[PDB]
Short mmCIF file of C-alpha atoms in Angstrom, two decimals:
data_model
loop_
_atom_site.label_atom_id
_atom_site.label_comp_id
_atom_site.label_asym_id
_atom_site.label_seq_id
_atom_site.Cartn_x
_atom_site.Cartn_y
_atom_site.Cartn_z
CA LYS A 1 0.00 0.00 0.00
CA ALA A 2 3.23 2.12 -0.17
CA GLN A 3 4.97 3.77 -3.21
CA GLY A 4 7.75 1.97 -5.12
CA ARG A 5 11.33 2.64 -3.92
CA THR A 6 14.29 2.43 -6.39
CA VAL A 7 12.20 -5.72 -2.91
CA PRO A 8 10.70 -3.34 -0.25
CA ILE A 9 10.97 -3.78 3.56
CA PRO A 10 8.03 -5.97 4.84
CA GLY A 11 5.24 -4.34 6.89
CA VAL A 12 3.51 -5.79 9.99
CA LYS A 13 0.76 -7.28 7.68
CA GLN A 14 3.58 -8.99 5.69
CA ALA A 15 5.12 -10.26 8.99
CA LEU A 16 1.80 -12.06 9.85
CA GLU A 17 1.54 -13.44 6.25
CA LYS A 18 5.28 -14.00 5.29
CA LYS A 19 4.61 -17.37 3.58
CA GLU A 20 1.90 -19.58 5.16
CA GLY A 21 1.60 -16.95 7.91
CA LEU A 22 2.49 -16.54 11.63
CA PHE A 23 -0.74 -18.41 12.56
CA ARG A 24 0.06 -21.43 10.32
CA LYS A 25 3.88 -21.53 10.71
CA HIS A 26 4.13 -20.66 14.44
CA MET A 27 0.71 -21.28 16.13
CA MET A 28 -1.19 -24.19 14.39
CA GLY A 29 2.25 -25.83 13.92
CA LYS A 30 5.44 -25.48 16.04
CA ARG A 31 9.01 -26.83 16.39
CA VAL A 32 9.15 -28.87 19.59
CA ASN A 33 11.45 -29.84 22.48
CA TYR A 34 12.09 -33.49 23.63
CA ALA A 35 11.91 -34.93 20.07
CA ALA A 36 14.25 -36.90 17.72
CA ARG A 37 14.52 -37.88 13.99
CA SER A 38 16.18 -40.92 12.32
CA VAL A 39 16.04 -43.33 9.35
CA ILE A 40 13.84 -46.35 10.19
CA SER A 41 15.22 -49.92 10.01
CA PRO A 42 13.09 -53.15 10.16
CA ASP A 43 13.03 -55.43 13.25
CA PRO A 44 10.91 -58.60 13.86
CA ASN A 45 12.37 -59.21 17.37
CA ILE A 46 10.70 -56.13 18.99
CA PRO B 1 5.65 -36.27 25.90
CA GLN B 2 6.74 -34.77 29.27
CA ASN B 3 3.68 -35.35 31.60
CA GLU B 4 1.48 -38.29 32.83
CA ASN B 5 -1.75 -36.96 31.17
CA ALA B 6 0.11 -36.91 27.81
CA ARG B 7 1.56 -40.38 28.71
CA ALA B 8 -1.89 -41.92 29.45
CA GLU B 9 -3.15 -40.57 26.10
CA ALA B 10 -0.24 -42.05 24.09
CA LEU B 11 -0.74 -45.41 25.93
CA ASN B 12 -4.56 -45.69 25.82
CA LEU B 13 -5.88 -43.48 22.97
CA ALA B 14 -3.16 -42.89 20.30
CA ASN B 15 -1.32 -46.21 21.11
CA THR B 16 -0.71 -48.68 18.18
CA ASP B 17 -2.87 -51.57 19.53
CA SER B 18 -5.97 -49.28 19.58
CA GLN B 19 -5.31 -48.56 15.84
CA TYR B 20 -5.81 -52.16 14.49
CA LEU B 21 -8.82 -51.01 12.41
CA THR B 22 -8.83 -47.77 10.38
CA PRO B 23 -11.99 -45.57 10.78
CA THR B 24 -12.19 -45.23 6.93
CA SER B 25 -13.86 -48.66 6.37
CA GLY B 26 -13.38 -50.35 9.78
CA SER B 27 -10.88 -52.79 8.16
CA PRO B 28 -7.44 -53.86 9.58
CA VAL B 29 -4.23 -51.87 8.84
CA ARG B 30 -2.05 -54.19 11.04
CA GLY B 31 -0.58 -57.59 10.07
CA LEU B 32 2.58 -59.49 9.01
CA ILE B 33 3.91 -58.60 5.47
CA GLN B 34 6.25 -61.09 3.53
CA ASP B 35 8.56 -63.77 5.10
CA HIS B 36 5.94 -64.45 7.80
CA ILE B 37 3.19 -65.14 5.19
CA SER B 38 5.47 -67.57 3.23
CA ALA B 39 6.59 -69.14 6.55
CA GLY B 40 2.98 -69.74 7.65
CA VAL B 41 1.96 -71.54 4.42
CA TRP B 42 4.91 -73.92 5.05
CA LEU B 43 4.54 -74.25 8.88
CA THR B 44 0.73 -74.90 8.80
CA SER B 45 1.09 -77.36 5.79
CA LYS B 46 0.02 -81.05 6.38
CA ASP B 47 3.60 -82.21 5.48
CA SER B 48 5.06 -80.14 8.40
CA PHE B 49 5.70 -82.45 11.42
CA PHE B 50 7.79 -81.70 14.59
CA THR B 51 9.45 -83.74 17.39
CA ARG B 52 8.91 -82.94 21.17
CA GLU B 53 12.31 -81.12 21.19
CA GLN B 54 11.46 -79.11 17.99
CA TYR B 55 7.82 -78.36 19.05
CA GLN B 56 8.67 -77.03 22.57
CA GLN B 57 11.52 -74.91 21.07
CA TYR B 58 9.12 -73.17 18.58
CA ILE B 59 6.75 -72.43 21.53
CA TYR B 60 9.35 -70.81 23.85
CA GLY B 61 11.02 -69.17 20.82
CA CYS B 62 7.97 -66.88 20.36
CA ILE B 63 6.31 -67.09 23.85
CA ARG B 64 8.40 -65.97 26.86
CA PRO B 65 6.54 -65.99 30.25
CA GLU B 66 9.21 -63.65 31.76
CA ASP B 67 8.30 -60.98 29.12
CA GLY B 68 4.62 -61.41 30.17
CA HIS B 69 3.61 -63.24 26.96
CA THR B 70 1.76 -66.03 28.90
CA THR B 71 -1.66 -65.98 30.65
CA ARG B 72 -1.14 -69.23 32.69
CA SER B 73 2.36 -68.56 34.33
CA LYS B 74 3.38 -72.05 32.94
CA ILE B 75 3.68 -73.01 29.25
CA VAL B 76 0.81 -75.46 28.57
CA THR B 77 1.40 -77.99 25.76
CA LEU B 78 -0.98 -80.15 23.69
CA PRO B 79 -0.43 -83.97 23.38
CA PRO B 80 1.19 -85.18 20.07
CA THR B 81 -1.01 -85.88 17.00
CA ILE B 82 1.08 -89.04 16.34
CA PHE B 83 1.67 -91.29 19.41
CA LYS B 84 3.03 -94.51 17.77
CA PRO B 85 5.66 -95.24 16.33
CA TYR B 86 7.42 -91.87 17.07
CA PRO B 87 5.76 -88.98 19.04
CA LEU B 88 5.13 -86.16 16.51
CA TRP B 89 3.34 -82.77 16.60
CA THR B 90 1.71 -81.18 13.55
CA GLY B 91 2.50 -77.62 12.35
CA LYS B 92 -1.12 -76.50 13.02
CA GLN B 93 -0.68 -77.64 16.69
CA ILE B 94 2.00 -74.92 17.19
CA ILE B 95 -0.69 -72.31 16.18
CA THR B 96 -3.14 -73.97 18.65
CA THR B 97 -0.50 -73.85 21.47
CA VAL B 98 0.40 -70.17 20.78
CA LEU B 99 -3.31 -69.17 21.19
CA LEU B 100 -3.70 -71.47 24.24
CA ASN B 101 -0.92 -69.53 26.03
CA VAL B 102 -1.77 -65.94 24.88
CA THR B 103 -5.63 -66.00 25.20
CA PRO B 104 -7.17 -65.75 28.76
CA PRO B 105 -7.83 -69.09 30.59
CA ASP B 106 -11.20 -67.81 31.95
CA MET B 107 -12.60 -67.36 28.38
CA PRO B 108 -13.35 -70.29 25.96
CA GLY B 109 -11.41 -70.93 22.73
CA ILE B 110 -12.08 -69.13 19.42
CA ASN B 111 -14.62 -70.61 16.93
CA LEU B 112 -14.14 -69.46 13.28
CA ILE B 113 -14.83 -70.95 9.79
CA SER B 114 -12.77 -68.83 7.31
CA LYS B 115 -11.18 -69.36 3.82
CA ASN B 116 -7.68 -69.22 2.21
CA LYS B 117 -6.16 -67.48 -0.82
CA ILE B 118 -4.73 -70.92 -1.88
CA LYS B 119 -7.34 -73.12 -3.64
CA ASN B 120 -7.77 -76.83 -2.63
CA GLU B 121 -6.55 -77.99 -6.13
CA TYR B 122 -2.94 -76.98 -5.24
CA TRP B 123 -2.89 -79.29 -2.16
CA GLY B 124 -3.93 -82.39 -4.18
CA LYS B 125 -7.04 -84.62 -4.30
CA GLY B 126 -9.81 -84.29 -1.69
CA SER B 127 -8.03 -81.70 0.47
CA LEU B 128 -10.07 -79.20 2.52
CA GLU B 129 -6.92 -77.08 3.22
CA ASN B 130 -8.70 -73.94 1.84
CA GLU B 131 -11.32 -74.01 4.68
CA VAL B 132 -9.69 -72.36 7.74
CA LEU B 133 -11.27 -74.06 10.78
CA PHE B 134 -10.90 -72.99 14.44
CA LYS B 135 -12.90 -75.03 16.99
CA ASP B 136 -12.43 -74.08 20.70
CA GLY B 137 -9.16 -72.26 19.84
CA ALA B 138 -7.74 -75.16 17.79
CA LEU B 139 -6.59 -75.02 14.16
CA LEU B 140 -8.07 -78.27 12.82
CA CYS B 141 -8.23 -77.50 9.05
CA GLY B 142 -6.62 -75.12 6.55
CA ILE B 143 -3.27 -73.27 6.25
CA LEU B 144 -2.79 -69.57 7.24
CA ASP B 145 -2.26 -66.92 4.46
CA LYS B 146 -2.10 -63.09 4.15
CA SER B 147 -5.92 -63.55 4.50
CA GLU C 1 37.79 -64.10 45.55
CA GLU C 2 34.40 -62.76 44.32
CA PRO C 3 31.75 -64.69 42.25
CA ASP C 4 30.08 -62.91 39.27
CA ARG C 5 26.35 -62.21 39.93
CA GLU C 6 25.51 -60.58 36.53
CA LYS C 7 25.96 -63.82 34.44
CA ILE C 8 23.17 -66.30 35.44
CA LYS C 9 19.98 -64.69 36.83
CA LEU C 10 16.68 -66.32 37.90
CA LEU C 11 13.73 -64.35 36.45
CA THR C 12 11.46 -64.36 39.58
CA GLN C 13 8.68 -62.79 37.42
CA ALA C 14 8.40 -66.25 35.70
CA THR C 15 9.61 -68.75 38.37
CA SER C 16 7.06 -71.30 39.62
CA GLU C 17 5.97 -70.79 43.27
CA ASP C 18 7.81 -74.05 43.88
CA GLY C 19 9.91 -75.28 42.30
CA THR C 20 9.72 -77.00 38.89
CA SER C 21 9.26 -74.08 36.48
CA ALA C 22 11.71 -71.20 35.97
CA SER C 23 13.20 -68.92 33.29
CA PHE C 24 16.95 -68.19 33.48
CA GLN C 25 18.78 -65.24 31.85
CA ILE C 26 22.49 -65.49 30.88
CA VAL C 27 24.55 -62.49 29.61
CA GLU C 28 27.18 -62.67 26.74
CA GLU C 29 25.66 -65.96 25.36
CA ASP C 30 23.60 -67.02 22.29
CA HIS C 31 22.78 -70.11 20.06
CA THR C 32 26.33 -71.57 20.70
CA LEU C 33 25.61 -72.56 24.36
CA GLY C 34 21.81 -72.09 24.10
CA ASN C 35 20.87 -74.87 21.63
CA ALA C 36 23.54 -77.23 23.11
CA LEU C 37 22.32 -76.66 26.72
CA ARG C 38 18.57 -77.07 25.92
CA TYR C 39 19.41 -80.33 24.00
CA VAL C 40 21.18 -81.84 27.09
CA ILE C 41 18.45 -80.53 29.53
CA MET C 42 15.76 -82.20 27.30
CA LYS C 43 17.48 -85.64 27.71
CA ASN C 44 16.55 -85.49 31.46
CA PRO C 45 13.48 -87.77 32.06
CA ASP C 46 12.20 -85.27 34.67
CA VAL C 47 12.25 -82.27 32.28
CA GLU C 48 8.68 -81.72 30.98
CA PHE C 49 9.36 -78.63 28.83
CA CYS C 50 12.61 -76.96 27.71
CA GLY C 51 13.61 -74.41 25.08
CA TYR C 52 15.86 -71.38 24.57
CA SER C 53 14.99 -67.87 23.36
CA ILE C 54 17.13 -64.85 22.47
CA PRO C 55 15.07 -61.68 23.28
CA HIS C 56 16.88 -59.53 20.62
CA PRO C 57 20.21 -59.77 18.64
CA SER C 58 21.51 -56.28 19.72
CA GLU C 59 21.16 -57.06 23.50
CA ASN C 60 23.65 -59.69 24.84
CA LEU C 61 21.06 -61.96 26.52
CA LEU C 62 20.13 -65.68 26.47
CA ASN C 63 16.93 -67.04 28.04
CA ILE C 64 16.44 -70.75 28.85
CA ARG C 65 13.13 -72.09 30.24
CA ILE C 66 13.06 -75.35 32.22
CA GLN C 67 9.71 -76.86 33.26
CA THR C 68 10.05 -80.19 35.01
CA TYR C 69 7.73 -82.82 36.53
CA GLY C 70 7.89 -83.39 40.34
CA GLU C 71 10.83 -84.40 42.67
CA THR C 72 13.30 -82.05 40.75
CA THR C 73 13.60 -78.22 40.68
CA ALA C 74 14.41 -76.23 37.46
CA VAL C 75 17.71 -75.12 39.13
CA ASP C 76 18.72 -78.83 39.61
CA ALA C 77 17.78 -79.59 35.95
CA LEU C 78 20.00 -76.66 34.82
CA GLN C 79 22.88 -77.81 37.12
CA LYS C 80 22.54 -81.37 35.69
CA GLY C 81 22.52 -79.95 32.12
CA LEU C 82 25.79 -78.02 32.70
CA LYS C 83 27.37 -81.03 34.51
CA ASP C 84 26.41 -83.37 31.60
CA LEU C 85 27.59 -80.94 28.83
CA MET C 86 31.04 -80.80 30.55
CA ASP C 87 31.22 -84.65 30.60
CA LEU C 88 29.95 -84.75 26.95
CA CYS C 89 32.86 -82.42 25.93
CA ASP C 90 35.33 -84.67 27.82
CA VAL C 91 34.06 -87.66 25.70
CA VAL C 92 34.59 -85.62 22.44
CA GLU C 93 38.09 -84.48 23.64
CA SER C 94 39.04 -88.07 24.67
CA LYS C 95 37.86 -89.72 21.39
CA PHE C 96 39.62 -87.02 19.24
CA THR C 97 42.98 -87.47 21.11
CA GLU C 98 42.71 -91.30 20.64
CA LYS C 99 42.04 -91.08 16.86
CA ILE C 100 44.98 -88.61 16.45
CA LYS C 101 47.27 -91.33 17.96
CA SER C 102 45.44 -94.11 15.97
CA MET C 103 46.43 -92.36 12.64
CA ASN D 1 -12.77 -98.25 26.30
CA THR D 2 -13.29 -98.77 22.49
CA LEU D 3 -15.97 -96.88 20.41
CA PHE D 4 -15.33 -98.40 16.91
CA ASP D 5 -13.40 -101.39 15.44
CA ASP D 6 -13.29 -102.78 11.83
CA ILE D 7 -10.92 -104.17 9.12
CA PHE D 8 -10.71 -101.96 5.97
CA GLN D 9 -9.48 -102.63 2.38
CA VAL D 10 -7.35 -99.80 0.85
CA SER D 11 -8.46 -98.67 -2.66
CA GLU D 12 -6.29 -95.48 -3.02
CA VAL D 13 -3.01 -94.00 -1.62
CA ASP D 14 -2.63 -90.41 -2.95
CA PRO D 15 0.26 -88.08 -1.88
CA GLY D 16 -1.19 -84.95 -3.56
CA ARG D 17 2.03 -82.82 -3.70
CA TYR D 18 2.90 -84.02 -0.12
CA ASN D 19 6.20 -85.85 0.60
CA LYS D 20 5.13 -87.41 3.96
CA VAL D 21 1.25 -87.47 4.04
CA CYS D 22 -1.24 -89.59 1.95
CA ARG D 23 -5.07 -89.60 1.57
CA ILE D 24 -6.30 -93.18 2.06
CA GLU D 25 -9.63 -94.26 0.49
CA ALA D 26 -10.91 -97.45 2.18
CA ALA D 27 -14.02 -99.69 2.45
CA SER D 28 -15.11 -102.12 5.22
CA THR D 29 -14.80 -105.88 4.58
CA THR D 30 -17.70 -106.67 7.01
CA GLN D 31 -20.19 -103.79 6.29
CA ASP D 32 -21.17 -102.87 2.69
CA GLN D 33 -22.28 -99.21 3.25
CA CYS D 34 -19.17 -98.38 5.37
CA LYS D 35 -16.48 -96.09 3.79
CA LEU D 36 -13.24 -94.36 4.98
CA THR D 37 -11.12 -91.31 3.92
CA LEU D 38 -8.04 -90.84 6.20
CA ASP D 39 -4.74 -88.84 6.11
CA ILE D 40 -1.71 -90.79 7.48
CA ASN D 41 2.02 -89.95 7.86
CA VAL D 42 3.25 -92.42 5.15
CA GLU D 43 6.90 -91.64 6.27
CA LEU D 44 6.33 -93.53 9.59
CA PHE D 45 3.48 -95.95 8.67
CA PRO D 46 3.52 -96.72 4.90
CA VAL D 47 0.20 -97.83 3.33
CA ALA D 48 -0.01 -99.54 -0.08
CA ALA D 49 -3.00 -100.10 -2.43
CA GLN D 50 -4.97 -103.36 -1.71
CA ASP D 51 -4.02 -103.62 2.02
CA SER D 52 -5.86 -104.81 5.16
CA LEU D 53 -5.86 -102.16 7.93
CA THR D 54 -7.49 -102.74 11.35
CA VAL D 55 -8.69 -99.16 12.10
CA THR D 56 -9.96 -98.72 15.72
CA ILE D 57 -11.42 -95.64 17.55
CA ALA D 58 -10.95 -95.53 21.36
CA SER D 59 -11.85 -92.93 24.04
CA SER D 60 -8.59 -93.49 26.03
CA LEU D 61 -6.00 -96.29 26.76
CA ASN D 62 -6.39 -99.20 29.29
CA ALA D 63 -8.52 -89.20 34.87
CA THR D 64 -5.19 -88.13 33.24
CA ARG D 65 -3.57 -84.70 33.82
CA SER D 66 -1.21 -84.49 30.75
CA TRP D 67 0.79 -86.58 28.20
CA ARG D 68 4.21 -87.85 29.34
CA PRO D 69 6.97 -89.46 27.16
CA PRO D 70 7.27 -93.30 27.59
CA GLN D 71 9.13 -94.53 30.70
CA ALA D 72 10.13 -98.21 31.47
CA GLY D 73 7.18 -100.43 32.49
CA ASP D 74 4.33 -98.40 30.93
CA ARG D 75 1.40 -100.41 29.45
CA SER D 76 -1.09 -98.92 26.93
CA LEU D 77 -3.85 -99.88 24.39
CA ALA D 78 -1.38 -98.51 21.75
CA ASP D 79 0.97 -101.50 22.43
CA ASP D 80 -1.45 -103.74 20.39
CA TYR D 81 -1.45 -101.51 17.23
CA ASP D 82 1.35 -100.10 14.97
CA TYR D 83 0.29 -96.45 14.23
CA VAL D 84 -1.69 -94.37 16.80
CA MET D 85 -3.08 -90.80 16.36
CA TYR D 86 -4.87 -88.46 18.80
CA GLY D 87 -7.54 -86.08 17.46
CA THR D 88 -10.99 -84.48 17.82
CA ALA D 89 -14.47 -84.88 16.22
CA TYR D 90 -15.64 -81.56 14.72
CA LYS D 91 -18.61 -82.38 12.41
CA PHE D 92 -21.58 -84.82 12.40
CA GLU D 93 -23.24 -85.15 8.97
CA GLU D 94 -26.28 -87.26 8.01
CA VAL D 95 -26.34 -88.83 4.49
CA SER D 96 -29.93 -89.88 3.46
CA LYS D 97 -32.01 -92.30 5.65
CA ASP D 98 -30.18 -94.26 8.46
CA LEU D 99 -26.64 -93.38 7.10
CA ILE D 100 -24.43 -90.99 9.21
CA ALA D 101 -20.89 -89.69 8.35
CA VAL D 102 -18.48 -88.43 11.11
CA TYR D 103 -15.61 -85.92 10.62
CA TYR D 104 -12.39 -86.22 12.66
CA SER D 105 -9.23 -84.06 12.70
CA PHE D 106 -5.84 -85.34 13.94
CA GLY D 107 -4.22 -81.87 13.69
CA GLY D 108 -4.92 -81.14 10.03
CA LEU D 109 -4.84 -84.89 9.19
CA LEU D 110 -8.57 -85.31 8.43
CA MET D 111 -10.77 -88.46 8.56
CA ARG D 112 -14.30 -89.11 7.23
CA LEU D 113 -16.05 -92.35 8.34
CA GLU D 114 -19.45 -93.23 6.79
CA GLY D 115 -21.81 -95.75 8.49
CA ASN D 116 -25.19 -96.06 10.30
CA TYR D 117 -25.08 -98.08 13.64
CA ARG D 118 -22.19 -96.06 15.20
CA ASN D 119 -24.53 -93.02 16.00
CA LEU D 120 -24.70 -94.05 19.72
CA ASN D 121 -20.98 -94.88 20.39
CA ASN D 122 -19.30 -92.23 18.13
CA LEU D 123 -19.87 -88.83 19.81
CA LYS D 124 -18.23 -85.36 19.30
CA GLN D 125 -15.46 -85.78 21.91
CA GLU D 126 -12.40 -83.46 22.22
CA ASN D 127 -10.49 -86.75 22.90
CA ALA D 128 -10.54 -89.66 20.39
CA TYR D 129 -7.64 -92.04 19.73
CA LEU D 130 -7.26 -93.69 16.30
CA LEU D 131 -5.24 -96.93 16.29
CA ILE D 132 -4.26 -98.90 13.13
CA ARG D 133 -2.77 -102.45 12.83
CA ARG D 134 -0.88 -104.43 10.07
#
């Protein structure tokens, strides 16, 4: 909603809707503590 | 999860055992996939016989009372299907014994008349090996497939 | 002198009130001793049921279940099994030495 | 005690892609209407075509807790016959007037006896011993 300057600096509306948005990227979904990731391997003895 | 309420939920609501049937069609999404299916067709085959030593080994090999697999605190065993000349157990009897030690003693055995993926023609003349028969928790007829 | 307590362990969670049935757990052992020991224990006329089970390959454990009839405990059946396997090995060692000389 | 006893003539011995089991088709030498279809472990007890088998059904051997391996000085009904099997009766079928056909299972090894008079003695018992001679 601002005039073109000779990519502009993002506004507070842009901050809440950067990509998916603050609500989707940091409220509905979040990075968590006490969690791990690894490649799965098969095991019939467990 | 870092609290008991979250623990109870992951052990009683979202736990694997409570997800045997999918809510999409109410059909199972849990079962054995490849080696186990091929192993079962061979183990439950009429030709598969086992000695006392072999039979008891297969039982303890999969059922360990110390790991709480039993319901009787002592591994119960069926008598052999062949008494004379040599004492021999059938393959199907191992399946009967596994159920006899994992199902509660207070409840009666399972009664089911099911079918197989393998047609009777493959097992020779006059075989009923397609008809899966369970009478009082005892596999008396038919092999066990992916089905 | 100090005896090792971590090797053979009696799983009390599976032992019969008295005294015939018990499950034993041995560390740093597998099929090698396992199948040989259950074979010898099964030759005992008092042993009703016997088998061996390895809980998982990654964990160094060996489980052996001995269920006997009366007048003999599972501990005695295990002690007889070990005593007989030792004598069995002596027979193998004696016959092999003799045939080496016989050559 | 005994529930059934007869001498049968073998008409067929079919393996059917089995290396140790065979489906035996037999007929009674005494009764005309009597027929037999039985699976036997041919590896231990071999059966040939045109053979005389003394098939006998017994309730037990002359209350037991469990089966024990043989130990010196043990006497049994099995000592009189060559091949003995333990199994259960699972189905009772009636074929036309007076004729009745029983279905037995010796752990997958199935048996189908067809007769008429045996309706009283042969009952669906979770314990039935099958003993064969010659």
